[PDB]
Amino acid sequence: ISKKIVESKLRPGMFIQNSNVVFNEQYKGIKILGKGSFGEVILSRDKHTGHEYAIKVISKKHVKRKTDKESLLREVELLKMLDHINIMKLYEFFEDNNYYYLVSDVYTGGELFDEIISRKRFYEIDAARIIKQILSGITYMHKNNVVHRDLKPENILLETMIIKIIDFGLSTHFEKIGTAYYIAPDVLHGTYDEKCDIWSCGVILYILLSGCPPFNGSNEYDILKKVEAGKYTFDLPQFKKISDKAKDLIKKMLMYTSAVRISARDALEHEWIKMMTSKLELSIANIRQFQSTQKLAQAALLYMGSKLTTIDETKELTKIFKKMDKNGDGQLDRNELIIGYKELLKLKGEDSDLDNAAIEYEVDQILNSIDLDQNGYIEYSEFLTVSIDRKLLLSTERLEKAFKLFDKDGSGKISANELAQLFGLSDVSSECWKTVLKEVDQNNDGEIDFKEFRDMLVKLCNY
16 A cells, blocks of 8 residues: 555755756756656756756656657657647756656646635636636647647646646656546547547546546546546536536536547637636635545555655665674764665665765755764664654655645544545555554544544554
8 A cells, every 4th residue: 555656865845956966967956846747856957048947857767668769759859849828848858877857947836726725715717717728738739749648637737827737748658646537538448649638627627616526436446437437427516506508518528439529629619618718606625625635645645655665774774784884883974874875776776966966965864863973973773763753754744734735624633434535545444444543533533633643644554
């Protein structure tokens, strides 16, 4: 459940400019922007011009290529020549023996739903303007023979408004929790055409208007089953106030047979879009429950995965430091610690400047957490103990942030029923979590607070 998906030494927001990491002898690494579709996104600065870019850094050893190199270079050349206000610009592609690099404009705005659910209220007109922009971008890209294939809220940035679609064109050439809701039966059945994008946008529209996905389930397998059948309904209370016009559009976007599914252009000119965007309060709270349940489940997964992964890596570092500790006093200096992390990834079988800088940064942040001796030596067991605590803290903070979103209008508590959804998405067995819920809910209220939720994740790593 947990250790498979995790098994990221750089943290979103961290400055790396002190490390003098340079990409392609041109772009200076400035700041880690986050984790993107197929690897890391780094704010970088052209050392000649000062122009800043977001560089997506994709690890070769972990990520695979579906097409030959000539196909990839031809699509990149096409991509470089396209411009649209709702499409994130790609400038360049390059590589070395460790990474693929994609240089794009600097991302503005947050993920679509995150930006919608930070606000107090959300209206039909907002949804229509959003979808109009998404459809404008898609229409343009299809007209230029570019298909996205992986369209979802995570790939749609909103600046509160201007929409930008990221990763438009990647998926053809390279091979989370929210994935399954958005993907078209076409691409599950391996039918290869542009209409899959209109299905994904129609799913997004359904969700914008109702706050609930049309093909839903407690886990991946159930969701993919509903998608497979392509059966959805407009029989939710939410849809009582939604016009026939909006419903008509969704119907045309979610046609199962792609040949009969409306095109992006015709969707763009649909009557609903014309009327709404020309010169009703939706359930933001449903959109929030949906989005925040996904985020908290992801954070719960990462908390367990990080805890378990760190235990394993600590045992291997302990063996490595034992060998290096020749006088047996348990003490090592900074360069010995660093060498030990490098040794570790040699046993894994990897040979990199960005990684070197990431290793020095982790080591230094652990050392900055300890009242260091002025001889330069550190007891490695203390180093590793502080290292464990630092990663639990970071994971706790991510859990905290996701919980804040989840509990915006709540009791400060999570129900058994919500716990079933979160752990359903995590693929954690009902008997494992119910057993742990017993230990943790001491007055049997059927509901627990944040710290109790966290203790439950700790115990699940021990079970």
